[PDB]
Amino acid sequence: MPEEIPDVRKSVVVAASVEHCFEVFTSRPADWWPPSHVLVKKERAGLAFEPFVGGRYYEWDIDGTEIVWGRILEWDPPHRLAMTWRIDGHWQSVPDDDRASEIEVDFVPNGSGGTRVELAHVKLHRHGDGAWNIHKALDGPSPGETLARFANVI
Numbered sequence: 001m002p003e004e005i006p007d008v009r010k011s012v013v014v015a016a017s018v019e020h021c022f023e024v025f026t027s028r029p030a031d032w033w034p035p036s037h038v039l040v041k042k043e044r045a046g047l048a049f050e051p052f053v054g055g056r057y058y059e060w061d062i063d064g065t066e067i068v069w070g071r072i073l074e075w076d077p078p079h080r081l082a083m084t085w086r087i088d089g090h091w092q093s094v095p096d097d098d099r100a101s102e103i104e105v106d107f108v109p110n111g112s113g114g115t116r117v118e119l120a121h122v123k124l125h126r127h128g129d130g131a132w133n134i135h136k137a138l139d140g141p142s143p144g145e146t147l148a149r150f151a152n153v154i
């Protein structure tokens, strides 16, 4: 979990359909948190989610107001989805992000309950500074990645 986030590409197979991956994203990605042991130091409270291109997702913190932590690029039918991230250095929103980067993600349905995803983030270091700190909100422990925590619960 280095302060700098260089371009890295990782892929993994999980038990889920591509439609499910997004159905859950706009339905309750924060709720994945189990009743025991909290993966996030902060208690997630709510999240706003809307489907579209140049889209936006929001998270509510019990002590933190509602904020947008990401963006989208375009939705490609059950097969590929690209997305841009819209967040500030201190989890704040702004009319435009000068340190915004683009991410390419591919979703393909495997079996009735199999999902293969290829997520590649690039030039994210553009935000540098507390860049991983922003990720700290998403919380991606080395021992377990987002694919692990969300796939296991699904």
Ligand SMILES: CC[C@@](C)(O)C(=O)CC(=O)c1c(C)cc2c(c1O)C(=O)c1c(O)cccc1C2=O
Residues within 6 Å of the ligand: 010, 011, 012, 021, 115, 117, 118, 119, 120, 121, 139, 140, 141, 142, 144, 145, 146, 147, 150
């Ligand atoms: C230790 C955290 C870290 C760096 O592993 C992480 O958080 C990876 C992350 O950007 C990420 C990646 C690489 C892939 C996926 C995802 C990741 O965010 C991911 O969230 C995901 C998902 O929510 C539902 C289906 C598939 C996926 C993914 O394939």
